Symmetry: C3
Subunit: 439 residues, 3 copies
Amino acid sequence: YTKPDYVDGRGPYKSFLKFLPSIRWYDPEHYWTNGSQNEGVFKNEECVLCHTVQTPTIVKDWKKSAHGNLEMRRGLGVKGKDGKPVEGTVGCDACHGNDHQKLFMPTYKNCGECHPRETSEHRSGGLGSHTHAYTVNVLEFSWHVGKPAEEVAGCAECHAIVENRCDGCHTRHVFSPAEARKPTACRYCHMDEWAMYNTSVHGCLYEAESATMDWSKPSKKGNYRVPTCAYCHMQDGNHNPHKAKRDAWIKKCQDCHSPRFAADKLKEMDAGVNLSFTKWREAAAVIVGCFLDGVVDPMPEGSPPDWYGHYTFSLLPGGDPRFYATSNLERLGLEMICYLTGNVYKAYAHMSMYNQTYGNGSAFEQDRKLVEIKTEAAKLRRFAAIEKKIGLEHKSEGFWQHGEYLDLLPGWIRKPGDVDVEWFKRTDIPHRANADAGV
Amino acid sequence: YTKPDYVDGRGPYKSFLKFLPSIRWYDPEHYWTNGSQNEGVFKNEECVLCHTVQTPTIVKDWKKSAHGNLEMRRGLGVKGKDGKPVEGTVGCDACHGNDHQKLFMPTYKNCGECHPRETSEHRSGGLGSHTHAYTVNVLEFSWHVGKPAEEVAGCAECHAIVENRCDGCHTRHVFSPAEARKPTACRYCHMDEWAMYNTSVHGCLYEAESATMDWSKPSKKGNYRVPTCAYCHMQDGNHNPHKAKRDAWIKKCQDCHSPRFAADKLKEMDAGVNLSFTKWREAAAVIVGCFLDGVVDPMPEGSPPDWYGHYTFSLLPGGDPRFYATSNLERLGLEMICYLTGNVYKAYAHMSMYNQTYGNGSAFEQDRKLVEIKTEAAKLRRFAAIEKKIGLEHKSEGFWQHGEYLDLLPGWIRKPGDVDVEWFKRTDIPHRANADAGV
Amino acid sequence: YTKPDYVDGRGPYKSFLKFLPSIRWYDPEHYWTNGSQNEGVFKNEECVLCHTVQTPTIVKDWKKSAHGNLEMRRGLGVKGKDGKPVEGTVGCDACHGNDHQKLFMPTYKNCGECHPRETSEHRSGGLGSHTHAYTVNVLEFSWHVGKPAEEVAGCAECHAIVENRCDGCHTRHVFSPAEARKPTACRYCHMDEWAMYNTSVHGCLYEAESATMDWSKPSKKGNYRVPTCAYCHMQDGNHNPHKAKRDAWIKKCQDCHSPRFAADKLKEMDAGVNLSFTKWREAAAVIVGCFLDGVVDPMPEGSPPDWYGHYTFSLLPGGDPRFYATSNLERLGLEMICYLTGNVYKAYAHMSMYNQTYGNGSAFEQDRKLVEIKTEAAKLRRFAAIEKKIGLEHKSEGFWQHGEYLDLLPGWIRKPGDVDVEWFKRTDIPHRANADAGV
Ligand code: HEC
Ligand code: HEC
Ligand code: HEC
Ligand code: HEC
Ligand code: HEC
Ligand code: HEC
Ligand code: HEC
Ligand code: HEC
Ligand code: HEC
Ligand code: HEC
Ligand code: HEC
Ligand code: HEC
Ligand code: HEC
Ligand code: HEC
């Protein structure tokens, strides 16, 4: 194994966090440098008919877009950068630049010149939304910072497409709202939301009607028979995704349904999640219970240190819950709470009858995982008992602590004074709760 | 944890079986009560243009239906309730009623007034079909009655849509046969039938042609190139799904294929299932073999009592085969026979080449599960051996028997004389074979 | 259990290898015999209008094909068998024959009369391609020969459709290139390539546009916005799927993308696979490490003999890596290298962001499997330690070695001098590296 080329990180853990050079297409404001052979300052017309030979699809798309094709316009009345409206064609130079040796890759800031509302709404969201997916939910996230860059390359890419740039639900060089309204524009990131929507009758009607139904109309009351990702969350074309919030859902459901039917189905979600929590309470008592007696193989000391730089239990306040570089009991615990408990919430919400019970990450799988946890707990307790009686001092195996991949973990290189807590002190952005956060 | 609002059960175990209030939309004959704020007796025209503002999609659908749009009719010659035919529009009041304080939710009985044939054929099916999915395969089913209502909410809902009401394969307010013919109208319930159909070339041709092919024609000989769920099982529009039954399939396959090709492929199914049974015979001998020696942790007594109310082995006559609240050896056993052995049958039948071998619930996974069972058996036998020699009396752990979810199980509250066996004594409906059935 | 009817094998292990009679539709050159009731020599016109009643779909397809419908032709200038071009209709007798008692089932040889280029390109491929999928990757393959015929029926069928006959990507009786261009024509065999393509944005755009986009155009530069299976691998309609090979991909990607973007994404693939290998190096050291100490339950001698006929370790040169009829430690090892390590390569290549990390057969699952391997290793080492101290001689269990399915394995009947090494000596076809290969 040889270490690939790395560029320096950007988050609060930037002292040791690294990125692959490909990050330039994902954080253009921060990592973009010129790398074009071609030179010269060109007019838009020169850009198009030179790229028709070189990169034909972009041009073909651009001609299928409102930016490039004036006939394909609805007279929105867009006013870009200056007050004056845009009547001419929005070309390649408008988005990328005129000089080839000074090309810039566009973000939400570049789009914000022409489209203020869609950008303002995009920046209005808080923690967990599209607004803070890269800045917070990548740079401060445990599994991303706790792993080498090439492993979590897709993690940085996926979370950054929706935050930084605008071509998430919009193809790239067509920017069609009809394409954006489709569930396909959402599921390549949301994958276990897609499985719930697919196994529900809402998703089934999509596949049945998508070829026939009119996609040109905006996601508004009456306009659509089949609900999509964009219809439910991006209400009336809004670019931002407990009685006040519940009645808001019932009113949206009242587009096609009775409010009584809407209320009953959302009450099913409450009752379904409540019973799934009791399954977790059983598991948590078992796993933590094994830690009290110290029968867990291996113990946190016998394992490699976590990304914080401590030898702490994963499923315990302070420690980092993980699936990697930990004991099997801790792995099966994290598997239940993160994946399975979260997916049951998604199953009841998206009205998936199968995934509520029999499906992937379901209540029946929660029962299966509960057995897996209990059997693991039974195994460790039987071993310890036998060892105690015969008079054997068992020590955790060497392969738990050290390995070719395990040595590459950043947990070994964590030293006091490497955290930039001034990043955490920021008021403009929300923050993830971490042990070494400072604040 | 707090217990949600429950309404009383209906099956033979109605003494302890409960349901969520949402069951009213699924068993309207039995659980529907009025819950509308709005009052007054209205004409159909008043119903439509008041609901256009409130619930627009229903109205838009109703106008896209033959019931609401007379232009969209094929002159079937429907004769509803009375002998006289229906020439006028079938409105909202025809299905739901005139008074808002006295609204009724329609079943197969309400549809049976106008459509006698489709209802008669629907009621003609026996055990395991759509006919007895809720009455028998929910109220008498082990995993449904053996679990709290909010967990198995979707179980009651899914099985009841196809039995009680008619909007299973038919959207709801469009009732399009073209939509019903599509596999999407079937797979939201049938999910592992869908995976087999999808990974087969039959399902692949569906996705390739669905946008282009004519869906308006009935499922008859010649009419379709690509076979669907509705084409194979609902032959010639029949609303009801060994040489006599085999030749019946070959003749149906002869619509597109050679009978020799049809016979060879169905012979593959016979040979494929035969070899999958020998894998089960190996597993069964191992799991039951561990019960003879009493090495299973935990033993039925160490586990919580089953839904019947006994401390019996799961994979043994009398006992209830389950994945929950049992030992790992018993869980892996049930996983193989119910899911994997059943799915192999589905894989060979639906001509899925991948799912016959490499797929989910396949022959190769049966091999994987066989190892999982054998390793579990090896673990228990090695433990017992060591314990015996050193002189240790091992008792099953406490977390097996008792837990927050485990205490909520109905197995603890089973008392003699709670079974309504007069339900089981019925001649009009088939019955599931249970231990405490009485007959 | 009773053994189904078997026909003799054909590969180098033909002494014990068997096939189901259904192989006649898959190896027609080798296994096809007449089995038709109907007799007589007929003209093409007699074939069509007799099969319109009997097998209507074939006829309807044939009329929708260029072979049967002259109007549906692009004037290719096909010249069949003789030099003279084909102007008349290519009928049923042209493909199958005139006499019913002397019908032949077509291969690539039968198609090669009319279409020389598409056949020549089909035969140009080497090991691992469509060219040698049945002859080499079935008859010489370990899991196929090491299992009874009815279990690996689909294995023979799937691998033979693409090699022997031509109706793989082409329906059967339509032979539409538009249908062949679609990913659906590929994924029924390629299933974990499909999951990677589906979860990527390339596959998402397919489902979004397939109903609208023009499929009639050939897979060429500019012609398509959305890349498919056929677009990427079958470049410019070529019927054959490190700087020289890398730049070839970048140029193909340059159809829609910047070469810098193309280079960066393929560099991500290199770095992603490199880190996945270190996870394997950890696993391999652990599993083989357990074999040195002899703590593996069961040991190769305690297991049934492999398909070669030896009692060797699976994950060791000479031995056969398998998931069946082996220890759990060996199973989990094979699961990682074959499925998971191979799927990570597929995930990075097909630009799937989800399947790079969280998906099925991913880097995060590699971490999960690494724990599973380590826990299994920990279990075996703890057992052996306890046994040694107390003075117990542990022997592997009987159910590992013998069973109803295990007895049916060909490993028991392997005798010296059963291998046809003259098959392996062939120069016209590449060969799989086996222990008993001879050369
Ligand atoms: C900055 C990053 C963004 C800009 C600028 C725009 N978008 Fe979007 N977008 C999305 C959807 C689903 C729609 C269709 C809404 C509907 O149902 O009607 C749109 C639409 C637009 C429009 C058209 C609005 C109009 O009134 O004409 C514009 C001008 C537009 N978008 C610009 C989806 C998404 C999305 C989800 C993943 C993101 C991140 C963005 N859009 C971001 C931007
Ligand atoms: C009571 C519960 C039901 C009534 C009343 C009807 N159906 Fe269905 N249905 C289904 C399919 C797949 C079709 C299309 C059949 C074809 O291929 O041609 C239909 C069609 C009908 C029709 C039209 C028949 C005609 O000759 O015009 C009527 C009037 C009709 N259905 C009424 C599917 C299903 C289904 C599967 C899930 C169920 C449960 C029902 N239908 C139930 C009813
Ligand atoms: C022998 C086994 C084969 C013959 C003879 C032909 N094919 Fe194919 N084929 C495939 C695709 C994806 C296409 C479309 C290519 C495109 O994008 O334009 C085709 C096309 C043809 C054509 C038309 C070529 C023309 O210039 O008109 C012919 C005559 C043809 N094929 C004959 C895919 C495949 C495939 C993949 C699974 C296989 C095995 C074959 N084709 C095999 C044959
Ligand atoms: C013909 C001589 C061209 C003209 C005029 C313009 N572009 Fe170009 N561009 C051209 C080629 C052959 C390439 C690929 C090789 C390379 O230099 O990278 C490109 C590349 C781009 C890129 C990607 C550059 C990168 O950093 O990866 C962009 C963003 C781009 N081109 C845009 C662009 C614009 C906006 C132009 C008009 C002013 C323009 N190009 C002119 C060929 C030619
Ligand atoms: C990939 C680039 C995405 C696309 C396209 C869409 N979404 Fe997304 N979404 C994505 C990420 C990485 C995140 C952040 C996850 C986190 O919690 O850190 C989100 C967030 C959401 C949310 C908010 C979830 C919450 O805070 O509770 C919603 C409601 C949501 N996404 C829905 C959604 C819809 C409807 C989309 C289609 C238009 C969509 N997303 C696109 C990744 C991506
Ligand atoms: C793109 C295909 C993804 C990859 C790669 C990863 N993430 Fe993601 N993220 C994705 C979605 C759309 C969602 C679901 C959001 C929802 O509302 O449930 C998420 C979810 C996770 C969460 C976990 C939970 C929570 O605590 O909020 C976070 C914040 C997050 N994602 C982190 C993250 C990182 C950086 C990844 C690599 C280690 C990981 N994601 C993969 C899909 C995208
Ligand atoms: C306007 C005043 C209305 C007229 C006239 C009719 N309906 Fe209605 N309906 C209306 C509203 C605002 C609501 C939702 C609030 C509520 O009372 O539940 C409804 C609801 C229904 C329902 C669902 C009732 C339930 O139990 O959940 C049904 C089945 C229904 N409406 C049907 C219906 C019919 C058949 C009518 C004609 C006689 C009719 N409604 C008239 C508003 C109005
Ligand atoms: C959900 C509401 C369903 C829809 C829509 C369809 N089916 Fe179904 N089917 C469903 C259930 C709950 C059951 C009973 C399961 C049991 O065994 O208890 C069935 C049953 C069948 C059967 C009979 C199986 C047997 O007895 O061997 C068949 C053949 C079947 N279903 C096929 C089928 C088809 C082709 C459908 C589309 C028109 C369809 N079902 C719709 C649930 C649901
Ligand atoms: C709707 C999405 C479903 C949910 C929820 C559950 N069931 Fe179901 N059932 C479904 C289908 C369509 C099938 C397959 C039928 C086939 O022919 O194989 C079934 C299968 C099960 C069976 C198991 C086997 C047999 O013994 O017949 C039964 C009878 C049954 N279903 C019971 C049942 C209950 C009540 C559920 C919750 C505990 C369970 N189902 C979930 C899909 C639908
Ligand atoms: C009517 C009398 C027919 C004429 C004339 C032809 N075929 Fe036929 N064919 C017919 C039937 C009723 C059947 C099914 C019963 C059977 O004999 O198998 C067939 C079958 C075929 C088959 C499949 C045979 C097999 O081995 O499975 C083929 C390949 C076939 N038919 C082709 C064919 C051709 C090319 C003809 C023209 C010369 C022809 N058939 C004439 C009925 C009749
Ligand atoms: C089923 C009949 C298949 C269809 C249809 C397609 N492919 Fe395939 N492919 C199939 C097999 C059985 C194999 C051999 C697997 C082996 O390694 O033994 C292949 C091989 C390929 C390859 C070569 C892989 C390699 O050697 O590295 C490629 C690139 C490939 N297949 C792609 C591919 C595409 C793009 C297809 C659509 C046109 C396609 N295949 C069809 C099985 C089948
Ligand atoms: C059709 C649905 C399949 C079945 C059944 C099996 N095989 Fe296959 N094969 C399939 C594909 C398209 C691929 C992927 C090719 C790629 O490039 O990755 C394969 C892969 C395997 C390989 C494994 C790896 C390698 O060493 O090349 C081989 C050679 C192979 N296939 C063997 C084989 C046999 C005979 C099967 C039964 C035991 C098995 N395949 C199932 C899909 C098709
Ligand atoms: C109907 C309206 C829909 C549809 C068609 C989809 N979703 Fe959602 N979704 C919906 C609800 C009512 C909820 C629950 C919200 C609540 O009451 O708490 C959700 C939930 C989600 C979530 C989880 C976010 C959270 O924690 O609150 C996500 C990420 C999400 N939905 C995304 C999503 C996607 C991608 C969809 C398309 C496939 C989709 N949803 C469909 C309502 C509806
Ligand atoms: C874009 C171009 C695509 C698309 C749309 C698909 N694939 Fe591929 N594929 C592509 C690349 C660049 C690679 C890696 C090749 C390399 O550099 O080594 C692959 C890889 C495969 C493989 C593995 C073959 C190998 O070992 O090299 C297979 C079997 C394969 N692809 C098939 C495949 C199928 C069936 C697709 C449709 C769903 C598909 N690909 C999409 C490039 C691209």
